[PDB]
Amino acid sequence: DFDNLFDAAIARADETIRGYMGTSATITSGEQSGAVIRGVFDDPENISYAGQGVRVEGSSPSLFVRTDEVRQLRRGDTLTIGEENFWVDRVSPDDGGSCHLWLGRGVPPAVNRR
Amino acid sequence: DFDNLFDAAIARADETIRGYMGTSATITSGEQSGAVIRGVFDDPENISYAGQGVRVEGSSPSLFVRTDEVRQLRRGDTLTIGEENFWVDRVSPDDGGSCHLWLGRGVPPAVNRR
Amino acid sequence: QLQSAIVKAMYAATIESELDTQSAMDFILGANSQEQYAAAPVRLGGAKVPHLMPGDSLNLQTAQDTDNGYSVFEQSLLRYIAAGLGVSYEQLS
Amino acid sequence: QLQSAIVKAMYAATIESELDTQSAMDFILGANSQEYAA
Amino acid sequence: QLQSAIVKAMYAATIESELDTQSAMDFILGANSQEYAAAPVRLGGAKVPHLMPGDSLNLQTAQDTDNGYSVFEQSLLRYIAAGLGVSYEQLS
Amino acid sequence: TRQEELAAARAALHDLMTGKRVATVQKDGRRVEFTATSVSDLKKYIAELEVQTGMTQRRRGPAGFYV
Amino acid sequence: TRQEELAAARAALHDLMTGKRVATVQKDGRRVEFTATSVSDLKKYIAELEVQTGMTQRRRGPAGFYV
Amino acid sequence: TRQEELAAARAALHDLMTGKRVATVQKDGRRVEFTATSVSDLKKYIAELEVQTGMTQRRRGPAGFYV
Amino acid sequence: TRQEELAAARAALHDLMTGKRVATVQKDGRRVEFTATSVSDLKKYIAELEVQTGMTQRRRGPAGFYV
Amino acid sequence: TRQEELAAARAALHDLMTGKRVATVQKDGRRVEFTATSVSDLKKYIAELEVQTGMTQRRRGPAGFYV
Amino acid sequence: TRQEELAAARAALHDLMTGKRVATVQKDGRRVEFTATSVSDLKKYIAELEVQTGMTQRRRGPAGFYV
Amino acid sequence: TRQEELAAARAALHDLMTGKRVATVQKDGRRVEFTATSVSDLKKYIAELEVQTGMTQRRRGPAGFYV
Amino acid sequence: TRQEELAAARAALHDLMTGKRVATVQKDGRRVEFTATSVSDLKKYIAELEVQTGMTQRRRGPAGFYV
Amino acid sequence: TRQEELAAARAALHDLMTGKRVATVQKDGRRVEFTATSVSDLKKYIAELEVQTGMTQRRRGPAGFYV
Amino acid sequence: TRQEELAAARAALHDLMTGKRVATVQKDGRRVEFTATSVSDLKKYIAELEVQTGMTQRRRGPAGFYV
Amino acid sequence: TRQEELAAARAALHDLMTGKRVATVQKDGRRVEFTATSVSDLKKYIAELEVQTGMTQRRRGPAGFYV
Amino acid sequence: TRQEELAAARAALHDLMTGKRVATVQKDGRRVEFTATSVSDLKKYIAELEVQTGMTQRRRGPAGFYV
């Protein structure tokens, strides 16, 4: 399928890591709508200060799922990591066998397109 | 308990290191009020100069508690470590099995909510 | 001692295949050709040199000598009772 | 005891190989497969 | 010495297998398990077995049942013959 | 739970046999390792639990001899 | 409390046998590695406490010969 | 399903034989290390599943001698 | 204090057997490692401590014979 | 497909023997290695399919003796 | 200080054989390593130290025989 | 395609013998590794190939004797 | 200068045996490592220096025999 | 080209023998390795190659005896 | 000047014996390593340089016998 | 050209023998490794080259006996 | 011109065995190392150069016997 004798190797590794850590989740709204997706979730830290001090500590969710499922996602669509809901903000370009999914929190902010 | 095979494995990792490293914490006030929590304490350094010479050397305590037993700690609540007392300032989100607790010193500063 | 002599001689050899018994003897010892458990008897023909692959072996036990001092030890006890019975040893034994 | 002597004397030689069973006899024990019982 | 000779002969073979001992007897020492004194075994032909890897059928060679014991009696019998005065060959 | 235990161990042999037993897996800052069991030892374990469970016969009692 | 840990030991053997004996686990600056045993030592170990407890027979008084 | 693994194993045998059995594939921040087995025991696994598979004959009943 | 010493050894055996005896722990700036001892050493030590302490009989004397 | 299997093996021996059995490659974080294979077993592997396939005779049988 | 050092050595042996012979300790910016000893040597050291110490009987002068 | 690869292999023997068998070659971020083979088998792969090629003889049929 | 020598050497033996012979130390840039000896050699050194020093008899001559 | 091969091999043996066989050489970001052969194989690699050439008598036949 | 190294080596032995023979020392880029020597060859070096120097008698001419 | 390396190799031995046989030297960003041989082989290399060189007598044919 | 090397060798011998044969040096970008010889060969090396040098007899020949 892949003319590199390596892509099948790394992609198969991608199956193992997602199967061996990072739980599974499901999509809400969007083209995929109801569908179950397994990836690897994590939440680092990020603090901004703005004025004299307005510390607004938050998070930065990421998924790292293979690209084939995450096709035709766009940005306005939402999803939930089990009990907790999120919404796609940015989709990383294909690494070669997968890509990263960057999520917000709560309701996606408006549209503001036209 | 969770579709990881890894978090449950690393769940064992945190409990032993929290047993092997650090001490117990006697939380005071807050909704938890009287409770005892195990954690690993460390107090790095930090020097600020402000004006010409205004060295205000202090420290930034940390606890690394397990998130299960420290839910809804909130922020204003204080905490006594051994014979000395601190007050929590930030509770980080869980890395997967535990988080970091950022401690102030002395009394918590006011409320200033309204 | 008599029973021990049988069993020590009763187990001539052994086979060390990881396959099933029925396939093993059909490949190493022969047999099969059944009519229609007790495993399978083997015809005593001749020669019958078997082919093998790694992981399998046919080891035949050397057992041990059947009179490792038995007969001489037998004489000593026989002498003992022979004196006790008051009759000559050579007559009794 | 007599039976044990038979079987122990019967299996005289043995050959092992990853090759085909039929092929081995052809290249080792002479064989006559060129023209049940092995 | 006679008693020690009995036991050394009375144990001939050993069975080493992580398999349950009941199946071990069935698949190695013939057995008649289709029928707690374990299980008897019928005396028959060679019954060569097919022990699995990791098993063994060690046969204990024991030792010379009369490793000098008769000769040792010769010395003792002579000595006791002196005590009783009767010639040793008459005694033994 | 023997029957699935049979299936699990037997499959565990196969994927290990070809290429597919994961000795360890690393994601940046999060890696785990597993003790690499041998192959021979597993087959004894494989052989052990199949006979003790309700699985069918796989070996019979020695072999007689007749002229 | 012998029986429950006996089952746990049996489970650990199964986990160790296929793929699940976790040797070490790594997080961002957080790692621990447990000591790793053999397989045979565990097999004799589990064999040790199953006989001492009240479960069914697995050993029989040698074997006799009749004719 | 014997032919599936049988074909897979022999393909793996050939794959492992020349150059292609990869014990570890590395992508930045993603290491997956498989275990590896020797060629011999791999052939033994090959040597077992096919004979219990109802494929063509591969074994023969020793060899008799005639003058 | 032999009784709790045995109990600690009893615990120190089973946890070591399955998965629990941790070789070392690292906490990103603080880590300690402990020497690993053989399973045989534990069994010998726990046994000799067991026989010397106040618990009941485990092993009797040599066996005799009678017709 | 034995012939191409044999042909791949032929180059596999020759390239490995001289300089070309690639142990591993490394594209700046995109690295992979392969399990090394001995030389004898590869010759053994290349030996068995050689006769197994429809290739010509390469080894005759025994040897006579006449005065 | 015979009793003191003997008790200290026994406690060290106990913790070592259970889980607590700290091989090396590292706190960021510093680390030390205590050398590791065997266990049989430690046990025989314990034995010689105690028999040297003024404690009670531990050995017996061979053994006799009588009908 | 036999004599020329023999010539390359024969050169490879000399290349490997003195100083020039490249084992690992490394560039910035890009590097590949070649497997290492002992000389004897390489000589074997040279020697046994001389017999099976049509080149000149180097072996003689034993050796007789005469007074 | 032999009595304090033997005393220090015996103390070193004791601490090494228990837990307290540090081989390697390091302070964020400054580190030292010492060569490590065995236990038997240290003990025999202790014995020979003790018998050479002014300490009284410890080992007596061979034992005779009387009816 | 055999004669200069002897010259090359003889030179390569010498400098290797003293100090001048480079195992590997690294310039920042560009490092290569060379497999190191033994001496005895190299020594005989000298031997069989010069006797193969037209080089003068190096070894002679077996020695006889006479009274 | 033979007694100086006699004292030096003997002092080195005790320095080596207890804990103090520094295998190597490093200080933030300034680091040297000293090759290690075992205790045996050290002592058997102590065993002769003193006998060849004017040290007192330490060896006696075999031993005689008398009833 | 036998004298130059004869002196060179013997000097190389002495430089190697004491402390000076450098196997690698690492300038900042520029390092190179020289593999080193044994000493007996070098010593043999010394012997063979000097005798084939027109050096004086160093060996004598057997040894006679007279009453 | 052999005495100085003899002096150099034994001087190299003494410090190497005590503490002072530097295995490698380090100057944060300027580091080297040397091959380490054993002590057995060095004693042989000093011995063989000792006798060949103009120094007098050290080891006499055989030994006489008389009544």
* Closest CA–CA distance from residue C24 to any residue of chain F (Å): 10
Q: Do I25 and B40 touch (CB under 8 A)?
A: no
Rounded to whole angstroms, the Cα distance separating C36 from I48 reads 60
Nearest residue on chain I to G20, alpha-carbon basis: I19
Which residue in chain O is spatially nearest to M27 when comparing CA positions?
Answer: O27
What method did the depositors use to determine the structure? cryo-EM
Q: Spell out the domain ranges in chain F.
A: 1-57
* Contact indicator for F56, E26 with CB cutoff of 8 Å: no
> CATH number for the domain including B55?
2.40.10.180
* CA B82 vs CA B20, B28, K23: distances in Å: 17, 12, 29
Interface partners of D (3+ CB pairs, < 8 Å)?
Answer: C, E, F, H, J
Give the residue from D20, D17, D22, D18 showing the smallest Cα distance to D36. Answer: D22
How far apart are the C-alpha atoms of N53 and N41, rounded to whole Å? Answer: 18
| Chains L and F lie in contact, requiring 3 or more CB pairs less than 8 Å apart | no
Q: Which residues of N36-59 are buried (b: 16+ CB within 10 A; e: fewer)?
A: bbebeebeebbeebbeeeeeeeee
Whether residue A54 lies inside any domain: the answer is: yes
Q: Residue P2: how many CB atoms within 10 A of its CB?
A: 12
3-state SS of L5-36?
A: HHHHHHHHHHHHHHCCCEEEEECCCEEEEECC
C-alpha dist (Å) from residue A77 to A73, A108, K23: 7, 8, 54
Give yes or no for D24 touching J (CB within 8 A).
Answer: no
Q: Which of I49, I48, I42 is nearest to G41 (CA)?
A: I42
The alpha carbon of residue F67 is apart from the nearest alpha carbon of chain D, in Å, by 10
Tokens of A87: 């919404």
Q: How far apart are CA M51 and CA M43, in angstroms?
A: 12
Chain Q nearest-CA distance from O9, in A, is: 6
The CA distances from residue H64 to C50, D16, D36, L37, L48, in Å, are 9, 16, 12, 44, 35
Instruction: Report the C-alpha gap between P44 and F1 in whole angstroms.
Output: 70
Tokens of J8: 């791949």
Distance between CA atoms of H17 and J9, rounded to whole angstroms? 8
Tokens 């002014």 correspond to what residue? M54
Is there a contact between F61 and C40 (Cβ–Cβ < 8 Å)?
no
Helix (H, G, I), strand (E, B) or coil at A82: coil
A85, A94, N51, N63, P44 from N57: Cα distances, Å: 90, 70, 8, 16, 22
Alpha-carbon span E7 to E62, nearest angstrom: 10
- In what helix (H) or strand (E) does residue O31 lie, and over which residues does it extend? strand O30-34
- Residue L64 one-letter amino acid: G
Side-chain half-sphere CA neighbours of J30 within 13 A: 10
- Is residue B5 situated within a structural domain? no
Chains that touch H (3 or more CB pairs under 8 A): A, C, D, F, J
For residue A5, with 0-12 CB atoms within 10 Å meaning exposed, 13-18 middle and 19 or more buried, which class applies? exposed
- I8 in Cβ contact with G10 (< 8 Å): no
Q: Which of Q65, H25, B90, E70 is nearest to A17 (CA)?
A: H25
Q: Nearest residue of P to residue Q46 by CA position?
A: P17
CB contact under 8 A, I16 and G35: yes
Long-range contacts of J37-42 (CB under 8 A, 24+ apart): J37/H16, J37/H17, J37/H39, J38/H39, J39/J13, J39/L37, J39/L41, J39/L45, J40/L41, J41/H39, J41/H40, J42/H17, J42/J9, J42/J12, J42/J13, J42/J16
β-pairing verdict for L22-26 and L30-34: antiparallel
For N9-50, give the DSSP string.
HHHHHHHHHHT--EEEEEETTEEEEEPPP-SHHHHHHHHHHH
Distance CA Q7, CA O1 (A): 13
Q: Which helix (H) or strand (E) holds E59?
A: none
- According to DSSP, the residues that pair with N31 across neighbouring strands are L26, N26
Q: Tell me the residue ranges of DSSP E strands in chain B.
A: 23-28, 35-39, 45-46, 58-59, 78-81, 84-91, 101-105
User: L60: which DSSP letter?
Assistant: -
Residue E18, φ and ψ in degrees, nearest 5: -65, -15
Neighbours of J17 (CB within 10 A): 24
Q22-27 vs M30-34, strand pairing mode: unpaired
O and I adjacent (3 or more CB pairs under 8 angstroms): no
- Residues B70, B79: contact at Cβ < 8 Å? no
How many domains are there within chain B?
Answer: 1
The closest alpha carbon to C50, from D38, P66, A101, belongs to D38
Record the tokens describing residue I61, joined without a space.
């004397």
Separation between Cα atoms, residue K43 and residue K13, nearest integer Å: 8
Token pair in block for residue F17: 């046999």
Cβ-based contacts of F38 with chain H (< 8 Å): none
Structural domain span for residue B45: 22-114
Residue K20 to residue I30, Cβ atoms within 8 A:
no
- The whole-angstrom distance between J46's CA and the closest CA on chain H is 10
Contact B79, B103 (CB under 8 A): yes
**G27 → closest Cβ in B5, B16, B95:** B95
Inter-residue contact C59 to C28 (CB < 8 Å) = no
Crossing angle of helices Q39-52 and Q3-18, in 10° steps, is 160
Distance between start and end Cα atoms, chain L: 47
Residue M47 to residue M62: CA distance in whole angstroms: 18
Q: How far is F31 from chain B (nearest CA, A)?
A: 9
- Tell me which chain C residues have a C-beta less than 8 angstroms from the C-beta of H43: 54
Alpha helices in C1-93 (DSSP H): 2-10, 21-28, 70-85, 89-92
For residue I41, give the amino acid letter: D
Contacts of I65 (CB under 8 A, 6+ apart): E3, E6, E7
Beta bridge partners of residue K34, listed in sequence order:
M22
Query: Do A79 and A28 meet the contact criterion of CB atoms below 8 Å apart?
Result: yes
Resolution of the experimentally solved model in angstroms: 3.9
First to last CA, chain A: 41
Instruction: Please tell me the number of Cα atoms within 13 Å of O41 on its side-chain side.
Output: 14
Residues in F touching H41 (Cβ below 8 Å): 39-40
CB pair distance less than 8 Å for N17 and P37: yes
Q: Are H7 and F18 in contact (CB under 8 A)?
A: no
Alpha-carbon distance of K41 to M41, in angstroms, equals 12
Q: Distance, in angstroms, between E49 CA and closest chain F CA?
A: 4
Task: Check CB contact under 8 Å for D10 and C48.
Answer: yes
Write out the two tokens for O7: 């004292």
If one counts every other C-beta atom within 10 angstroms of the C-beta of residue K28, the result is 12
Per-residue b/e over D8-36, b at no fewer than 16 CB within 10 Å?
Answer: bebbeeebeebbbbebbbbbbbebeeeee
How far apart (Å, rounded) are the C-alpha atoms in residues L23 and L32? 9
Distance (Å, rounded) from C-alpha E11 to C-alpha E62? 9
Question: Integer distance in angstroms from the first to the last C-alpha of chain Q?
Answer: 46
The CA–CA distances, whole Å, from L52 to J62, L45, L46, L56, L57 equal 20, 11, 10, 11, 10
| Residue F12 to residue F20: CA distance in whole angstroms | 9
Q: Reduce the DSSP state of residue H22 to 3 states and report it.
A: coil
How many CB atoms lie under 10 A from the CB of residue Q42?
A: 19
Show the tokens assigned to G26. 């790594």
Residue I25 near chain B (CB below 8 Å) = yes
Locus of tokens 């150099």:
Q8
CB atoms within 10 A of CB M27: 12
CATH fourth-level superfamily of K1-57: Head-to-tail joining protein W (3.30.1580.10)
